Amino acid sequence: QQSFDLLVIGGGSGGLACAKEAAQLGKKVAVADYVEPSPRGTKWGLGGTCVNVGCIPKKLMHQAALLGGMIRDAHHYGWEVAQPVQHNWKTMAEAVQNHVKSLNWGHRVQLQDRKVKYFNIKASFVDEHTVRGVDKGGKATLLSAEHIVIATGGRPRYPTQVKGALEYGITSDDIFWLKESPGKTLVVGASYVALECAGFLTGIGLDTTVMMRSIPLRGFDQQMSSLVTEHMESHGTQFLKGCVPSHIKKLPTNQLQVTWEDHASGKEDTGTFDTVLWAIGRVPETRTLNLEKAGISTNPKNQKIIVDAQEATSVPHIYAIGDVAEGRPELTPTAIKAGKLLAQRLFGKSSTLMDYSNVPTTVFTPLEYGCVGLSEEEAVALHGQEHVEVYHAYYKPLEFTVADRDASQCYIKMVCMREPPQLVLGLHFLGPNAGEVTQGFALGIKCGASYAQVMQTVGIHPTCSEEVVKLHISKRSGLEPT
Amino acid sequence: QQSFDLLVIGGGSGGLACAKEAAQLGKKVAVADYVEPSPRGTKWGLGGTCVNVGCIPKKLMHQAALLGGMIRDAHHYGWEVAQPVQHNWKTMAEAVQNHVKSLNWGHRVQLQDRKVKYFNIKASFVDEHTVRGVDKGGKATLLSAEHIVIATGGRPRYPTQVKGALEYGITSDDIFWLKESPGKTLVVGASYVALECAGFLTGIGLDTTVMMRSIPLRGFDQQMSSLVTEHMESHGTQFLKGCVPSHIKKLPTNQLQVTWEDHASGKEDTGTFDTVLWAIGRVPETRTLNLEKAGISTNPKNQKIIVDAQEATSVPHIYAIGDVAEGRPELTPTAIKAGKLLAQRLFGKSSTLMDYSNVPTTVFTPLEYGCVGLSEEEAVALHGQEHVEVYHAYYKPLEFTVADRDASQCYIKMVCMREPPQLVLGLHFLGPNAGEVTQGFALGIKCGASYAQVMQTVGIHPTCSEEVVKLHISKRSGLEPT
Ligand SMILES: Cc1cc2nc3c(=O)[nH]c(=O)nc-3n(C[C@H](O)[C@H](O)[C@H](O)COP(=O)(O)OP(=O)(O)OC[C@H]3O[C@@H](n4cnc5c(N)ncnc54)[C@H](O)[C@@H]3O)c2cc1C
Ligand SMILES: Cc1cc2nc3c(=O)[nH]c(=O)nc-3n(C[C@H](O)[C@H](O)[C@H](O)COP(=O)(O)OP(=O)(O)OC[C@H]3O[C@@H](n4cnc5c(N)ncnc54)[C@H](O)[C@@H]3O)c2cc1C
Ligand SMILES: Nc1ncnc2c1ncn2[C@@H]1O[C@H](COP(=O)(O)OP(=O)(O)OC[C@H]2OC[C@H](O)[C@@H]2O)[C@@H](O)[C@H]1OP(=O)(O)O
Ligand SMILES: Nc1ncnc2c1ncn2[C@@H]1O[C@H](COP(=O)(O)OP(=O)(O)OC[C@H]2OC[C@H](O)[C@@H]2O)[C@@H](O)[C@H]1OP(=O)(O)O
């Protein structure tokens, strides 16, 4: 409607967190949220990427995949389950989507409850105080606010140069919302999204292939990333390595013929799929905002908004947070916390800056990969090989023994300073429930734990996590880690 | 055979760990291990209580129980599993026992490999240097060693005053080794063993009742312990509260008639069961050792061996470790580490004492209960109510949402010093994979983490463990923790 103390652009992780906390500190607040449909026509309700097309539906479909492995395990443990059990996509999708819809509805209620006005409106900047929104019926509204927070996230990237990509392909925005099973799927890319989605698809019994141009998980510890794909490949996910697509043709059968260049052989290859998922990175949502008309600068390389440590862009009453802000982890919890701390600096007398250092993650691949702190390469880059010590182990989950499941690849490494007491720099855990395991150790890093303090931490037995506290074989010794 | 550098009595967690590490430091070592059958005739191979009748088979049968819940979850996630699935005890038991046998065999091999002589012999002290062992064929052997380590563990207690208890009842020693299903089971006691076993029995579909005289889990945080049983009772485990048995009669049908006094009503009650499991604590294995003949003192109250900080009893060349040693957590990892550190102080020039402070545990109840540090009561006892701050939360695992499972009771509390930065004193987590979650936070405690450092630790999303790092509602505020 009118002027506001705070207007937030983007009803997502960072923006809803900021809006709510601004409204709890007594402020008059608006949020504008609009979901522009994917090129395939997928759109969804309030809450942003995590809620609707990110962490939440991803985690749940991963769990669908894990549950199929649980069912096989169960017969070793005495359950007389009738054995090739079928999976129904539609039952899954339906359940997953219903939970997402309950989150859309919980966010609306929390807005209503805190008296935040939500405008289902596609905002762009008219000046540095003012924004024009257009609803789904083509109606324009004008909103201005004293302070503006842009938390507009990003969306899936499409390739250029691949004819048929835009017409026939789908992205992570569509996958969670498919009416029917995608059947035989090519996943193009090598990121955590690519590997996560490929993973759960293989896990629910679909014929799945991953096309990587180069390395898996660029920017993640490379020895870990390669364990993660080795596991995926032993467990039924196909990999086209050193391959890049060149065009897609839709066949009379509605199947999709993919042509690609294969750099490991030097030949062009072809294969036929039911679905092609592009998961080749994401682009920040800034181009439509008319940033120019507000004086809001963006780094041209990526299309992100340039911010300082207090989350301010180049216009002083204006902030950006989450995936749209340059130099920021693209994670929900960091966007949430940043939004909270910004609300609290603006309206709450707080001086607390957001701390983006040693943030933990987990990749929810079929075997999960949890990490916090430095990769081993970044450590040796920062400090020198001779000033680094690495403790490592292969281990077998107790639950894998009776289940007869493969623990090759259940591997942990802890990267440290070499001089005593050996400050821990990074932890890397591949195994079941890796995000459960990792979290507490992020606190140890925050506190400046050493390997000395790790040796003196007693294990909980029997657990996988205790193997972290049992680590004792150094890479420098060259002794057997299994 | 002869004299040895080190002789260990008890081929269990602490003793095998000590023997192996003594032998890796170049020493000539013997271990004597003998399993005296349970009153019901159950016996088993090398490795001690954890391997054969403790953590390992307990954890695996818990997992059997969890897998039955996984199968129900799976149909919500799209798996078309045929639904009341039956459980076969015998398939389970067989699998569990085979894995135990593989551990018995791995320990024999590791002894052989390190050239430790294993005497399957029931040792007792003839003097402070010398021990007589008697094999299963009644043959006596004499062994002496310069240093002796007693790591003889404990066994299940039987009640006095309950006629029929010794004849008809079984203990944790028997449960893992049953040929047939125990069918309808009364579990007498209120300890973690009682609640663990009751739990997995209910979980594999057996009609299960727990008889508690008093409180659940004496010595554990009482609000947590009561959540744990509330969950067990919502999920099909029956509880007779304030009840104590008085005798058991075997009926012509071979069923077991239990009479008890019920203190909450004041009446005697009766009920008929197929199995009665006594889980009313454990007694240290010292009475047969002829400790008297070595000068080795025991605390009369319990029958434990009195040790100092270096694990020495009252005879200087002689040590005790594990469950038999007074004032020591009865846990495998503490017994293992103590054995390692003792080997290293004796034969390795180390000065490192074992640290028994802030050891983490997990109770592997149907909903798992992980903790480390102080209970809330011990905190307020040590520091005063006005000098303590408690952060708490109810939460729902994401995986419970689609599965439609009950999260009442998924509760976390973090007990702190009240003055800033609010040093963390205790963490208490009830939820899935609680031992996975807890472990890293034990390291935070070891390092002296504060609540200030907890607020600045970023969550991994979506996980249960992140809820620990999200804690913000204090009991002092009186605000809603859900
Ligand atoms: C498939 C996938 C899996 C993921 N898995 C995880 C994970 O497991 N853990 C994790 O931490 N993170 C995960 N993430 C990343 C996480 O979702 C993001 O880091 C987070 O959602 C970013 O939140 P945000 O505040 O920056 O913006 P978003 O949640 O992206 O919200 C932006 C909102 O603004 C809207 N918007 C854009 N422009 C306008 C405008 N002009 N007017 C009005 N509204 C507009 C968008 O439609 C959206 O609603 C995943 C992401 C994806 C794609
Ligand atoms: C049902 C149950 C569940 C448990 N769950 C867990 C858990 O999940 N996590 C955990 O950490 N702990 C658990 N424990 C406790 C754990 O098993 C013990 O704390 C640990 O095994 C103690 O090891 P130890 O070295 O003291 O002796 P033990 O493993 O008990 O070994 C003692 C060995 O010595 C033998 N022995 C005794 N006397 C003689 C003698 N005269 N001559 C020769 N040999 C002799 C015994 O038969 C046995 O082999 C559990 C225990 C039980 C009963
Ligand atoms: N065109 C093409 N064809 C086939 N496969 C491809 C292609 N482009 C990328 N990819 C792969 O998919 C992944 C996408 O991740 P990324 O671009 O970093 O994700 P974001 O852009 O969301 O990340 C944001 C920024 O932060 C860090 C990162 O550098 C980004 O610039 C990546 O590992 C790529 O392999 P590749 O060989 O490793 O490039
Ligand atoms: N006779 C009888 N009838 C019915 N139920 C009973 C009976 N005796 C104990 N119990 C219950 O079973 C549990 C056994 O645990 P515990 O004796 O502490 O185990 P341990 O002896 O292995 O522990 C070693 C020591 O360390 C700590 C502890 O104090 C011990 O002394 C306990 O919670 C008891 O309830 P209760 O009401 O709480 O007594």
Per this entry, what is the length of chain A? 482
Q: Do B453 and A463 touch (CB under 8 A)?
A: no
| Experiment type | X-ray
The pairs formed by A401-406 with CB atoms below 8 angstroms and a separation of 24 or more are A401/B60, A401/B99, A401/B102, A402/A73, A402/A76, A402/A77, A402/B60, A402/B63, A402/B95, A402/B96, A402/B99, A403/A72, A403/A73, A403/A76, A403/A77, A404/A76, A405/A69, A405/A73, A406/A234, A406/A235
Cβ-based neighbour number of residue A128 at 10 Å: 16
SS3 B132: strand
Alpha helices, DSSP H, located in A54-126: 55-76, 89-113
Angstrom CA distances, B75 to A73, A80, A205, stand at 16, 16, 15
Site to probe by mutation for ligand 1, drawn from A35, A55, A126, A171 as the one with most ligand atoms within 8 Å of Cβ, is: A55
Distance in Å, CA A285 to ligand 1 centroid = 10
* CA distance linking residue B196 with residue B213, whole number of Å: 17
User: How many helices, marked H, and strands, marked E, lie in chain A?
Assistant: 14, 22
User: Which residues, numbered 440 to 469 in chain B, qualify as contacts with chain A under a Cβ-Cβ cut-off of 8 Å?
Assistant: 440-444, 446-449, 453-454, 456-466, 468-469
Partners of residue A359 in chain B, C-beta under 8 Å: 458
Q: Which residue type, as a one-letter code, is found at position A134?
A: V
- Whole-angstrom distance, CA of residue B189 vs CA of residue B186: 10
* Architecture of the A1-156+281-357 domain: 3-Layer(bba) Sandwich (3.50)
Give the integer Cα–Cα distance in Å for B306 and A211.
65
Distance of CA A472 to the CA centre of its chain: 32
Q: What is the CATH number of domain A358-482?
A: 3.30.390.30
Q: Is B87 a catalytic residue?
A: no
Residue spans of the domains in chain A: they are: 1-156+281-357, 157-280, 358-482
In chain B, the largest separation of any two C-alpha atoms, in whole Å, equals 70
Residue with CA at minimum distance from ligand 2 atom 35 = B10
**Which of B61, B77, B473 is best to mutate for the A interface (most A CBs within 10 A)?**
B77
The reply to whether residue A463 touches residue B332, judged by beta carbons under 8 angstroms, is no
Tell me how far CA of residue A47 lies from CA of A106, A188, A343, in angstroms: 9, 27, 18
Superfamily name with CATH number, domain B157-280: FAD/NAD(P)-binding domain (3.50.50.60)
B contacts of A63 (beta carbons < 8 Å): 77, 398-399, 402
Distance of alpha carbon B474 from alpha carbon B397, whole angstroms: 21
Cα B211 to ligand 2 centroid, rounded to whole Å? 25
Q: Which of A96, A332, A443 sits opposite B449 (nearest CB)?
A: A443
Which residues are registered as beta bridge partners of B428? B371, B413
Q: What is the DSSP string of A389-404?
A: EEEEEE---HHHHHTT
Is residue B360 within 8 angstroms of chain A, CB to CB? yes
Measured CA to CA, the distance from residue A159 to residue A189 in angstroms comes to: 11
As a whole number of angstroms, the distance between CA A238 and CA A211 comes to 9
- Interface touch B67/A59, C-beta < 8 Å: no
Report which of A409, A424, A432 is spatially closest to residue A233, judged by C-alpha positions.
A409
Which of the 8 DSSP states describes residue B219?
T
The reply to whether A138 sits in an annotated binding site is no
Find out whether the beta carbon of A329 lies less than 6 Å from any atom of ligand 3.
no
B95 touches chain A (CB under 8 A): yes
Using alpha carbons, list the distances in angstroms from residue A458 to A444, B312, B318, B371, B442. 14, 21, 25, 12, 8
Q: How many residues does chain B have?
A: 482
Task: Give the whole-angstrom CA distance, residue A126 versus residue A123.
Answer: 9
Ligand in closest contact with the CA of A37: 1
Chain B hits for A67, CB-CB cut-off 8 Å, are 70, 73-74, 77, 79
B1-156+281-357 and B157-280 have identical folds: yes
